[PDB]
Ligand SMILES: C=CC(C)(C)OC[C@H]1O[C@H](O[C@@H]2C3=C([C@H](C)COC(C)=O)C[C@H](O)[C@]3(C)/C=C3/[C@@H](COC)CC[C@H]3[C@@H](C)[C@H]2O)[C@H](O)[C@@H](OC(C)=O)[C@@H]1O
């Protein structure tokens with residue numbers, strides 16, 4: 001057994017056990033492990049699922065705490081809001097560390113090793129996703145900065161995805177889902193959001209009509225969002 | 232607002248956010264906070280729900296990893312088992328710290344402050360529960376020791392519960408559920424387990440027949456177990 005082999009297995013154990021932080025760590029070793037070559041599809045997916053689950057938990061907590069803050073804030077209960085926001089800060093702190101860790105990994109190892117359209121779009125998308133999560137809770141110039149990095153990353157991913165991957169590709173399809181969610185939720189531009197989602201959903205139907213549980217699911221998400229946003 | 236007040240609110244926020252470790256911490260402050268008086272019902276319940284969720288996660292991970300170890304162990308795959316058990320140890324380590332933290336809290340503050348049958352049984356039950364979780368993964372003399380502490384604790388809780396709380400009391404009902412699960416799962420004595428569960432379930436039906444979503448649920452659990460164990 002090899003060290004890389006070990007960590008990947010360990011990662012999959014972590015996943016089964018649902019200790020995502022440890023899954024992240026294992027996949028992070030594997031990543032920093034090799035240099036010239038890039039992560040396999042399985043590995044690349046384990047690394048993102050790991051992070052997705054680590055960030056996801058804080059994101060859900062953030063939302064919960066956030067809506068609670070909103071309600072107490074509107075009831076004038078100023079002592080409750082102070083405790084909620086103090087708690088929120090703690091959560092926004094972990095969100096920041098999490099995004100930082102993966103964003104560093106992306107620029108240092110991940111992106112520089114992308115040897116194909118598949119991985120380049122996968123990694124550039126990730127870059128956009130994590131700056132997007134930062135933008136979700138920031139406000140001042142911090143938000144602008146994160147929103148800008150997000151846009152830059154997604155555009156870069158789209159250029160490649162648009163010319164190198166099939167419209168039915170799940171990575172390209174997910175890039176569209178997230179890119180349009182970005183326009184709707186961070187840039188509050190439902191128009192640019194629906195266009196993008198629509199075009200992507202359409203191009204996929206076309207190709208599917210002329211020429212995976214994977215892509216099918218992502219497309220369902222695009223519909224749920226096209227629907228929802230039309231209201 | 233008081234420090235105790237703050238931590239309790241914070242704890243409830245932690246619960247909503249599902250960051251149980253932090254919920255435990257907050258309730259632990261509150262606990263070590265007062266001295267003469269004891270935790271309110273709400274507080275006492277928040278403290279146990281906190282721990283329950285913290286220990287529960289490791290317990291579920293442990294089980295997952297454990298069954299995986301079993302399967303690879305039976306396929307002779309000795310390299311996989313070594314990695315699984317190494318991972319398992321890590322989990323058994325957190326289980327131990329978690330049980331230790333709450334068990335110390337029980338002997339130092341919690342139990343010494345129980346001023347009624349309600350709390351004495353609640354805390355003695357907890358004591359039994361956490362030694363039981365230790366017994367779940369131990370084997371040598373470690374298991375014996377934990378199994379013994381469990382039995383001692385549950386018996387002590389039962390004596391009080393049996394004479395001071397109604398058969399329909401959820402704490403007494405839960406003490407029966409756990410005490411009988413202890414006989415079935417740790418002492419591998421389905422007979423002593425079914426008797427206890429049965430008697431408790433019966434005494435509750437009687438009292439309910441002659442003289443809460445709370446007790447109703449616990450009793451359903453007792454049935455599911457009486458049923459299941461009769462197979
Ligand atoms: C078992 C765990 C691992 C190894 C992580 O695999 C999970 C999943 O990994 C793959 O799916 C990816 C994938 C996901 C799919 C949307 C899930 O599809 C279904 C129906 O299971 C979820 C993950 O987050 C993941 C890896 C991520 C992305 C995401 C990339 O951001 C940078 C946007 C697109 C999407 C792509 C990469 C999907 O291909 C597979 O195509 C999935 O479907 C199949 C064939 O069963 C499998 O369930």
Ligand SMILES: C=CC(C)(C)OC[C@H]1O[C@H](O[C@@H]2C3=C([C@H](C)COC(C)=O)C[C@H](O)[C@]3(C)/C=C3/[C@@H](COC)CC[C@H]3[C@@H](C)[C@H]2O)[C@H](O)[C@@H](OC(C)=O)[C@@H]1O
Nearest residue numbers: 273276277279280283353356357401402405406444445448
């Ligand atoms: C909202 C969170 C808190 C404050 C923790 O309350 C959760 C719950 O807290 C109370 O329920 C307790 C209780 C639980 C009940 C079995 C849940 O009942 C239902 C239908 O919601 C779950 C918890 O683990 C807790 C606190 C624990 C125990 C356990 C004690 O071990 C030492 C064995 C018996 C049981 C007792 C103490 C139950 O009374 C209430 O009676 C519950 O039911 C009502 C009236 O809605 C409420 O949902």
